[PDB]
């Protein structure tokens, strides 16, 4: 916030009168910072509290970003507040950006707050005819999952390094790797978002198998279906008058 005496006064010294000190700005040119900070600063939050990265989207769930540094100024009226965000994205902006592969940092007007509705990568979403294929590309573009799937790589190339020389099998590696991830896969839903975001994935397959030639070498191939997030919905309201025929039917 720029420096005014009545607003955001410079903390002077115990004798050197300094609090009476102004700055010089008006329209839109007084220090900014990229939304990426709060985005990452929520991934951190979505780790100390939960453990994975489901908790970085939406209002009720992840990205809320409480208490931002707004600004107020008295030009001629009576302290006309200035929204903390650079741009006041509307609703279809939140979406019409998600398709471009951008992460909009939309603000709630006046509330002096924000939220990340979309957390998509720059990957193309495609469309495709086959329904399955179409859904694949929709989840891959989604950043929040690739954050989680990445955390499995940090498990493999990190932990299994311990048993690099131990005698193990196709049926043993499928044990160690599965027995772990098993505590993070469910189908049942827990009350509240946080209590459920503990479980990122829905279900997982882990089909490892030895290769010919190299005796001590293997080749895994996992596949994870993350808990698909809400993303929107259409709705057609109508007065049917056919639901309860006892009131509108012929027989009476």
């Amino acid at each position: 916030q720029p420096y005014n005496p009545e607003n955001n006064p410079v903390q002077y010294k115990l004798m050197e009168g300094f609090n009476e000190f102004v700055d010089y700005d008006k329209n839109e040119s007084y220090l900014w910072g990229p939304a990426s900070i709060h985005l990452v600063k929520n991934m951190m939050r979505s780790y100390d509290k939960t453990r994975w990265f489901q908790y970085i989207r939406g209002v009720e769930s992840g990205g809320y970003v409480k208490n931002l540094v707004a600004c107020v100024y008295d030009n001629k009226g009576i302290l006309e507040t200035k929204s903390p965000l650079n741009v006041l994205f509307a609703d279809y902006m939140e979406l019409s950006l998600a398709n471009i592969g951008l992460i909009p940092f939309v603000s709630e007007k006046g509330t002096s707050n924000a939220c990340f509705f979309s957390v998509n990568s720059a990957k193309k979403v495609e469309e495709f005819v086959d329904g399955f294929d179409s859904a694949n590309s929709r989840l891959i573009a989604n950043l929040s999952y690739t954050m989680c799937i990445s955390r499995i790589s940090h498990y493999i190339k990190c932990v299994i390094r311990d048993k690099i020389g131990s005698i193990v099998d196709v049926e043993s590696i499928q044990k160690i790797l599965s027995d772990w991830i098993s505590e993070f896969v469910t189908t049942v839903y827990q009350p509240t978002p946080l209590e459920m975001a503990r479980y990122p994935f829905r279900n997982v397959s882990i089909e490892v198998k030895t290769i010919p030639g190299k005796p001590g070498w293997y080749s895994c191939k996992i596949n994870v279906i993350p808990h698909i997030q809400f993303e929107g919905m259409n709705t057609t309201m109508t007065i049917d008058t056919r639901l309860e025929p006892e009131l509108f039917g012929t027989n009476n």
């Binding site: 279809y92 979406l95 019409s96 993303e231 259409n234 709705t235 057609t236 309201m237 109508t238």
Partner: protein
Amino acid sequence: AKNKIPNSRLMINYETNVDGVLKKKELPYRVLVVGDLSKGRSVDAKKEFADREVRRVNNGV
């Protein structure tokens, strides 16, 4: 507008369109009577038979 509004994330529309076959009002049982009333003395009687608009007696005789 045919251009159509940009879709938001939660587009609700409310359908108000209703199809169905329209009704038909009943037919009053018409009764034609034909007799020499005017004896050749009336606006519709003095005209050629090819063009004699039949009356109705909506009001009364």
